Design a protein around this ligand. Structure first.
Ligand SMILES: [Ca+2]
Ligand SMILES: [Ca+2]
Ligand SMILES: [Cl-]
Lengths: 329, 328
């Protein structure tokens, strides 16, 4: 008899490629698979006016669903950071193993259940670039007072070294950089960074370290989910899984297409790496901070131990398999 | 209302990972469809024809199969390319190629002539070079080497004097114990341990030949067309989600089993093919590919797609994950 009409709030602006494709793809799959019994309207930042309001929208049930990143909610609960990615952590293929087979989904459920929110993988970008900089980073002294848009745990790490991170939303990044409200920023990589224009005013494009395997997030209000019949519940969860996996393939695809153009069409972009002493300080600050976060909360210790042990185990296989292969051929 | 389908799979019963992919798909379809589509899975113990899947599905005796596309290379050489290629793409790259790079559509052009629909069926990731009784120190050690190895790699190693040999799977261990073969490859730590090859072959080589083995679901086209559109989408989305989950599971099982291997099997010795040998295999591979491409237009089209795409995507893999792994 009954049809369900839901709405999804997403962080991204309207027609945002790749990220906005995952939500649309998800919604279309649900509509088709349900023969119209479950339909999901997508509201982008231009509609709901709150790019970073998604967690509150879904908790309250004003929206039944959201699409965002777990690490945006660090202010609400620092344990939300670790389900997105961590500096020096796992690459995408590893993190998927961790989520679906290494206990990651279950840890995420223990963190989010307290809010009456269900959280699911919402798409991986793969390994992200270090970002866009107006001036080169030559020593740790260059990080002091550096105003940089960078989320999650890397933001905390750079702050420990004297930087001033912020979490300005995608639609506001260019203007903030143009005005020197930030001196640098990171977003994703070649899949998405070029159309956003940062290259016009920040010519140094740094390689990564901080976001090896960024997974986005779908969120679903538990009470809304419970109201669904069981077959539509499954349709929803399988659609989100499929859309999320495909987003990693799209991120890979787009990164290749866009890197090819970058190699040919941007004579003023200069790719850079952090000097060894800078990277050494960052690795250390990361280790120091992980140890500090782990000690102040047993749920944090549990999550970081799972990530750390799991990375140790799976990286050995990555090294024996794909890395050996990519290094050699 | 209620569709009752069967699927025939190459693998024996309760085969971990590969047999999980089909069970996982069937469970997702039953549940999403509220029972309107269910799929019984017959393993090889039941239909008795591990390499009969292609014909089962083509005839419609079974609505679906799960197997590997390169097992059909004897029927049509172009089926090899949708599993994997020596020195080709790793799994994350190959998924991009399938879904955004034109691979699904090429696959369709090949399989449409048989009234079969082929879909990705799960990636194993990068596979080990295999299990060896004697070390491969030079190209001379390949000559006369009897080895179980499928797909294009088998065609390459033959070109170099080896004797790719056919053996079912249940007999892989025995064949190697009986010296019917001198070596073999299967998959990697995820599945090789349960097979006991480490007991008979001390040397375990790293890969080259199957950098991203994608299995396949097959669906009989007429059967597919008999479904209403909502069931059709349930089936295809289920297949996609199960396929992707199998790579996650393969990664997971590999990490687990590599740790177990290192703790429990002391005299498994990790090797890599010396440089002059890989240069020789590389060269044979390329020469041989150019040969097959020149004889068959569909082959040329598929290899140009695969090569152009690999060159593109690999530059990003190198800049992103590879550099990251190398540096940390
Ligand atoms: Ca980022
Ligand atoms: Ca193999
Ligand atoms: Cl918590």
């Amino acid at each position: 008899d009954k049809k369900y009409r839901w709405k999804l709030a997403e962080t991204w602006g309207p027609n945002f490629p790749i990220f906005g494709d995952a939500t649309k793809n998800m919604a279309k799959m649900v509509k088709e698979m349900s023969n119209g019994r479950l339909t999901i309207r997508i509201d982008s930042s231009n509609k709901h006016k709150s790019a970073l309001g998604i967690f509150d929208f879904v908790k309250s049930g004003q929206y039944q669903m959201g699409h965002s990143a777990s690490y945006y909610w660090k202010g609400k609960n620092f344990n939300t950071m670790f389900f997105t990615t961590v500096p020096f952590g796992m690459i995408a293929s590893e993190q998927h193993a961790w989520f679906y087979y290494g206990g990651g989904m279950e840890l995420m459920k223990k963190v989010y259940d307290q809010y009456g929110i269900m959280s699911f993988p919402g798409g991986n970008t793969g390994n992200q670039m270090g970002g866009w900089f107006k001036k080169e980073i030559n020593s740790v002294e260059d990080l002091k007072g550096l105003k940089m848009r960078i989320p999650g745990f890397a933001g905390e790490v750079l702050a420990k070294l004297g930087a001033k991170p912020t979490n300005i939303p995608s639609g506001e990044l260019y203007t903030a950089l143009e005005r020197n409200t930030i001196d640098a920023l990171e977003w994703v990589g070649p899949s998405l960074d070029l159309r956003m224009g940062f290259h016009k005013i920040a010519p140094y494009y740094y390689t990564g370290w901080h976001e090896p395997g960024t997974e986005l997030q779908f969120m679903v209000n538990q009470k809304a989910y419970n109201s669904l019949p069981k077959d539509l519940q499954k349709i929803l969860t399988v659609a989100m899984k499929a859309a999320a996996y495909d987003m990693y393939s799209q991120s890979m695809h787009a990164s290749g297409v866009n890197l090819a153009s970058l190699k040919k069409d941007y004579p003023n972009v200069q790719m850079r790496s952090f000097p060894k002493p800078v990277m050494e300080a960052i690795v250390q600050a990361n280790d120091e901070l992980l140890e500090e976060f782990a000690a102040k909360d047993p749920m944090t210790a549990e999550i970081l131990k799972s990530l750390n042990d799991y990375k140790h185990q799976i990286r050995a296989w990555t090294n024996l398999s794909d890395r050996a292969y990519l290094d050699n051929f």
